[PDB]
Amino acid sequence: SNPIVDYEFNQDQSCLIVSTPKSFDIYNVHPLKRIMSQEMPDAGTIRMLHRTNYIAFVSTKKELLHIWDDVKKQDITRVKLDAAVKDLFLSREFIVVSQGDVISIFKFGNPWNKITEDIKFGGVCEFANGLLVYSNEFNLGQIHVTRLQTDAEQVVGKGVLVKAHANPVKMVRLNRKGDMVATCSQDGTLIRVFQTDNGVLVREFRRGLDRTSIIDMRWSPDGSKLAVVSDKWTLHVFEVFNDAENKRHVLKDWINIKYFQSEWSICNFKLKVSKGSNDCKIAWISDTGLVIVWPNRRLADTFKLNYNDDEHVWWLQLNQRNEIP
């Protein structure tokens, strides 16, 4: 009887937090077990802060943003919002809110205030590990990457402008450390990866020949692989860095082309999707595991990433499916 309003993973992928009309609940992603539930009226988009006791959610009743402390069972603060909230992010330092046509940044902790003037953007943004990335307001295939300086005059700040795509950016995904950004356009034809320091292009991958829209992207725990789901409804896995290049070794003949490399997924899986579910989200359970969450079905599919050592080839397997509930 309870529809899922919003759902997200905590930063390290260990938990799933969802809001219903009657409540919000927190699940352990794998193995999948409900960790806790809390009755709440009209909870909107909802986010989590690591495994800590703070949880954010946007009132679907009002323009309010509730910051909820689970130890004492109350709002430490409520924050007035000027528009609809498209996206939301938390760190022990900042609170980042994408609302309507702008991005607002608030201090986490007293006095929970706005420490810089709202940032106008083109609809697409992501914040992880102190690093902010967003679509440009005018050119929609360009992105800005900038660090948030907590101690500085002058928390703005600096920033880099990358022309990521020809067509406008569909979505954006930071890896865990935050040094790479995976990048996507409306085409969904090819996926790019940029270094966050300079915004220089690291790698380019081809998803397919035909245009599609891309539902999700997520980086492996060790930052070596990137998982992607399109609306063609196939899961793709790309290897961005093999072991040596990931560990920053010295590569003996790296210059040749050597290698002239990859460009395509090492893995696909064609997903069977009921006519209902039009969106989902991806989590890495481990360096070889994955989970897909489907809001409509309240369903979690567990996938196994296999490697054949002798043939140097990979394949995907679906291990399990579990209702939420």
From Swiss-Prot:
One of its GO terms (cellular component) is cytoplasmic vesicle membrane. InterPro entries: PROPPIN (IPR048720), WD40/YVTN_repeat-like_dom_sf (IPR015943), WD40_repeat_dom_sf (IPR036322), WD40_rpt (IPR001680). Keywords: Cytoplasmic vesicle, Membrane, Protein transport, Repeat, Transport, Vacuole, WD repeat. WD repeats lie at residues 164-204, 209-248. It is a peripheral membrane protein. It is found in: Vacuole membrane; Cytoplasmic vesicle membrane. One of its GO terms (biological process) is protein transport. Belongs to the WD repeat PROPPIN family. May contain a beta-propeller domain involved in specific binding to phosphatidylinositol 3,5-bisphosphate (PIP2), leading to the association of the protein to the membrane. PANTHER family: WD-REPEAT PROTEIN INTERACTING WITH PHOSPHOINOSIDES WIPI -RELATED. Involved in mitochondrial or peroxisomal functions and amino acid signaling pathways. This is SVP1-like protein 2. The lineage of its organism: Eukaryota, Fungi, Dikarya, Ascomycota, Saccharomycotina.
